[PDB]
Design a protein around this ligand. Structure first.
Ligand SMILES: Nc1ncnc2c1ncn2[C@@H]1O[C@H](COP(=O)(O)OP(=O)(O)O)[C@@H](O)[C@H]1O
Length: 88
DNA sequence: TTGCAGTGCCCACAGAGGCCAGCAGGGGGCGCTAGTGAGGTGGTTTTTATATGTTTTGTTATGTATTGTTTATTTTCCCTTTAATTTTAGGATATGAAAACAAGAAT
């Protein structure tokens, strides 16, 4: 089928658990500069798995919320997707 | 002797014509002068002409500037040869990141 929606925890300006909306056949993510939007794609690649450098980040302990400043949100992060396919 | 018919003489006063002064006619020759007219001489200027001085024009010589000339040092186009310099593996490093182990903590 396709990807229904994405769930993030303590990752790239995403405090706590927030349910991102369900994804239709063609949606879009729009916002001004520095709004924290490419990080959604970074999480998509992350749950798919890829080396840290292409996520404009090193050592993979900087990916937690608040880590680039220097004060992490916690030592604990979830990311989770739900794939929706036909046959219910 | 006389009357009558006819003659002689003396005068005189118009009568007449030469004499004469007066006076007017024509044209000959001289005394004198006003007023031009022309001709000759002298003065003046003047005008042409001639000679001298100054300046203007023409010719000659020297210096400067322009054009040309064979050098002559660029200069620049064209070779063959290096001296950096770049590119391609090939090995080694490093720093990360899972992975396993060991250490609290809970059940
Ligand atoms: N964990 C984080 N917490 C807070 N701010 C962050 C965090 N990671 C990145 N940022 C900052 O958020 C800003 C938004 O950029 P980013 O999140 O990368 O996405 P986008 O490029 O779509 O704006 C950047 O200045 C980035 O440095």
């Amino acid at each position: 089928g396709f990807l229904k929606l994405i769930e993030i925890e303590n990752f790239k300006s995403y405090k706590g658990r927030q349910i991102i909306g369900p994804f239709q056949r063609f949606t879009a993510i729009i916002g001004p500069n520095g709004s924290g939007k490419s990080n959604l794609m970074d999480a998509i690649s992350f749950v798919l798995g890829e080396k840290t450098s292409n996520l404009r980040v090193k050592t993979l302990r900087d990916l937690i919320h608040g880590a680039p400043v220097g004060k992490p949100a916690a030592n604990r992060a979830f990311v989770s997707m739900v794939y929706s396919e036909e046959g219910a």
